[PDB]
Subunit: 338 residues, 4 copies
């Protein structure tokens, strides 16, 4: 359908807009519990509603945020003051997105390598989510690097690629732009060069599968890890190194019909997440927009500021805006540091 | 686990027992509605319970039937007289089995080629079904032959193989013997030789995938189509031909660690279904047991006899027994015709 | 080896230089026989030497031609006047290249689909050719489109990709930049959209294989067909269409680490070959250089001018220069027509 | 061609005849040099001719040897007394076979993992070899187990399978039964269970590729390693273990349309090679004939007896006969030890 293809491509380009990127706010109940913990907030619906409203009602946010990934609860939620979360996003011109996977399950007879579940009923969910205001979807797969254990195994990589390709095609049949997230975890003490090799291998398998399932790259986005040393390493790789190996790994594997690569921050500090993106965009221009789809790296300071205390709201929204601005500028290679 | 492997292999061999095979009684509500229609029975739970009890309470059935595939409702059902369906099977020494797929969905951007859905929550369902008395599972995939349209497409075959391998591994992790059913439909007017070529191609892909997912063949069973002309053909292929091409297609693709091949009857008459199996077992002995997993081909006369009329019960159970005996004898290559 | 990688990447970029492209002059004895026929020249070594010298001694040719693909004879040949062919190329700053495949052979049990032969002794040949002055290599694979016959078959595509990946890796181990040529023939009456679909499928398989064999894309080049209607079609597709579908097919499949895509002209007129390239480069800038590797489309007029008559030499070299200029300008999207 | 298929299947069954197996006498000049060394014989043609004649003229050899694999020299050789080597084989009713690979080459950018070369000109060679009296061919691929280095790598396995499938199809198009030899070397100190896992993985890939290339299994033979501990292990696995894991690895992967599995002895003593085969055939009957294709394990004592001394001829031929008888009896599970 030319009409569906056009819509998907237009929406994908709008999400990958220059100077903008994604707020990943799609923490499940159990994932958000953890965050609310760090600042000693109790995880009532009302609080989740307060926090999500705090994010999405931030004045001017849409200058830097093109799209927000929601958890299903939030998609159908109202702010404490009674406005639908989707209408907050719409007032800032931020496109609502929806996490659609059902999370992870061990692959039988692997060393705790994970499949991503969620295809059953996906098509029907996508239809409902579109009617609810979503225009893009997210599905996260996870791989581990462990050279001693041959991780990621063939089965790991082939499963991740199968699920991502099926999900992406199903999204596109339902007018949702799929974000394809094959996250290679930082777990371990491998060097950046090992991450690079594994990332290239995984992305080659993912894009071959996307092609096999007839996914329209013009109407899709990628959300990969940056290429870094493992998290058991004592010093992080330099920003220059991370940018070098990350851009190279992408240029080696990703066809340029894909309109955007929206990195996950994967445990990086807020500042590193901005600086590492900025370094890639000094190296511009590129075949595709290199931008951000950040959760913690946009939210961590905002949360630690808000503190569960309502009174801390304005301060926390200002802090969210500082980080959104930083990453918008980093998209353009114009972030000066903070 | 040696213990789990042992159990699976023992159970698979028990299902593929000489002189016996499977009653496929796993019709969904909507599938059973159709059958109850032909004889003008209304599809109440009570009737479904009456009919399933009529099958499973048939005295001596376990002489010829090693295993019965149930629909979930039936697994947790009681006969009209109040005995659990599973306890009827247990009294005849018939192993309960459970259909675990969630049925079919179109693959995006194919010409109505089908994925089989059901992996989400499968592992947990298998655990519950095992506790309920199931010891084997069934998952049906479907492929079409259409040479003009390049059916079955690569995407069709690769999806069918992926789902069957994932399902089989998940079953085995939960102590259930998986029946792997990749049914190539008879739709169309292709010759038996075309069916043979496609069957061999599909089975080669299925068994490579089973190997890739670490499925234990000793603890699995296959439920393939026989190799026949398409159903738009004027005369069926001869029993000798069907047996020739079917056994050859299997010998060309199936490793002999697999303990049984339990054919689906796929629209064949009750008599053809018996004769075609019998012809294969004159050609014995074989590397694996060639037997039956029949639904209509065991049930059609039984249903048309029972008529929804209770009074017709004994006659219908006698008729079921005639067909069970016929197919048990056919497993041994000793069926004389009926 | 950083050193070998650096050399390959530098040389690939030099071949894919802006405003320049490749003269494909690697006609075998039997292929060149045909050309010499059209103008009634007899195929003596001396004539082949005269014609190749006529091409390579063309004054100023290196303004538009970065590289020349030779046949083995020519690589070790002297011009009639006694100068080595390689030294003619070196005086114009044109990089010598070498065809290294051994041509085509039918794949058993296909409908005359072709494997490309040549891996045996390739590594050793590459070493010798490098010592002889070659810095890049060429290997041609061929695929056919026939939807009724399911061409190109899986076996066709997988063989083409295997041979190209093996060859490319072997070249790179020997310091030669591989030109990867998977030519999809124009044979048949399929529409441009069918060519596009098949081209994308083939390129996806080729680049996955290149990744699997550890080929360095930064040190390689692609020589694909343009995307066109089949040659049994009455009107050629418009330049705009050909450019649209060709650039899209590339953007959909080719990672942008590849430095150049040097099209084959595949039976196009000299003028179409220039105009179609020029149209793609109005659509610039691109993720990779889109340029030319033309044989007939650079040579046809030159040959028909020279006529086997020596006296026609200057005229024929002027004619070669007109076409080289045209295609150099087309690389830049600045060709005005001829 | 029914006619070619019939011939191949008949010949494959004749090679895999009960109570018989293959003498692998296809040592290249450089391989035979080594053997002639151990007993201080100088490697003249005349000696190679003497030794090969000593083997092939052994009276009654054809009771136990169905087929002899030759090196090309030997296929076109005469015995010292002037009889063609092929005519010696024909007088004993032994089918001549021919090694057709061109040996091994490193795969670029692997840790010295090997491709097998030889496809170029294979078809034409097969035609000539058939005219010369060959009716079966051999092609050896090699893989290593090194879990620390992820050997055998995907590239290793996929290359081995590609070459074996291409070669097998080409042989069959030329009326030669292909012996498919994917030898997993014993190098290293891995346990028998690791060998088993790797063997199963490799055979699954090989047989999927054979299917993809349209190889007729009924007209082919396999020559795999037995499943054993690595050669750096202090005690060999027991005969019972080796037989258990070897038969299981085959039953798990090899379709039973294949008529024979003719093991390589891979560094085993003459006695172990016989006992290990005999142990497998106590476990009979099997889906395919389990037999032998032995070089050293048939020849070692014969060579050490002959000593380069002509006078030792009769003794050496008697010794060859003892080992041929032993392995013929082992095929039948009736060898009592020596």
């Amino acid at each position: 359908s030319q009409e569906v293809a056009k819509e998907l491509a237009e929406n994908a380009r709008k999400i990958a807009a220059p100077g903008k990127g994604i707020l990943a706010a799609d923490e499940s109940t159990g994932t958000i519990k953890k965050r609310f913990d760090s600042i000693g907030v109790e995880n009532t619906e009302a609080n989740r509603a307060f926090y999500r409203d705090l994010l999405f009602s931030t004045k001017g946010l849409g200058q830097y945020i093109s799209g927000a990934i929601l958890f299903e609860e939030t998609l159908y939620q109202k702010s404490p003051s009674g406005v639908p979360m989707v209408d907050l996003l719409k007032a800032e011109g931020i496109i609502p997105g929806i996490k659609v996977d059902k999370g992870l399950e061990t692959l039988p007879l692997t060393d705790d390598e994970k499949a991503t579940m969620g295809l059953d009923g996906l098509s029907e969910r996508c239809k409902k989510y579109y009617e609810a205001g979503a225009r893009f979807a997210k599905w996260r797969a996870v791989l581990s690097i462990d050279p001693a254990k041959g991780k990621p195994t063939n089965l790991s990589i082939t499963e991740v690629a199968h699920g991502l390709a099926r999900y992406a095609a199903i999204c596109q049949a339902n007018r949702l732009v799929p974000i394809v997230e094959p996250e290679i975890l930082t777990d371990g003490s491998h060097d950046i060069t090992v991450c690079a090799e594994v990332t290239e291998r995984v992305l080659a398998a993912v894009f071959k599968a996307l092609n096999d399932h007839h996914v329209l790259l013009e109407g899709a986005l990628l959300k990969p890890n940056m290429v870094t040393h493992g998290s058991d390493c004592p010093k992080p790789a330099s920003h220059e190194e991370i940018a070098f190996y990350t851009v190279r790994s992408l240029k080696r594997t990703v066809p340029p019909a894909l309109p955007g690569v929206m990195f996950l921050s994967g445990g990086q500090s807020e500042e590193d997440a901005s600086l590492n993106l900025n370094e890639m965009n000094k190296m511009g221009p590129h075949p595709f927009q290199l931008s951000f789809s950040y959760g913690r790296a946009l939210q961590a300071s905002c949360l630690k500021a808000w503190k569960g205390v309502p009174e801390n709201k304005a301060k926390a929204q200002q802090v969210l805006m500082e980080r959104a601005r930083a990453n918008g500028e980093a998209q353009l290679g114009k972030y000066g540091g903070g």
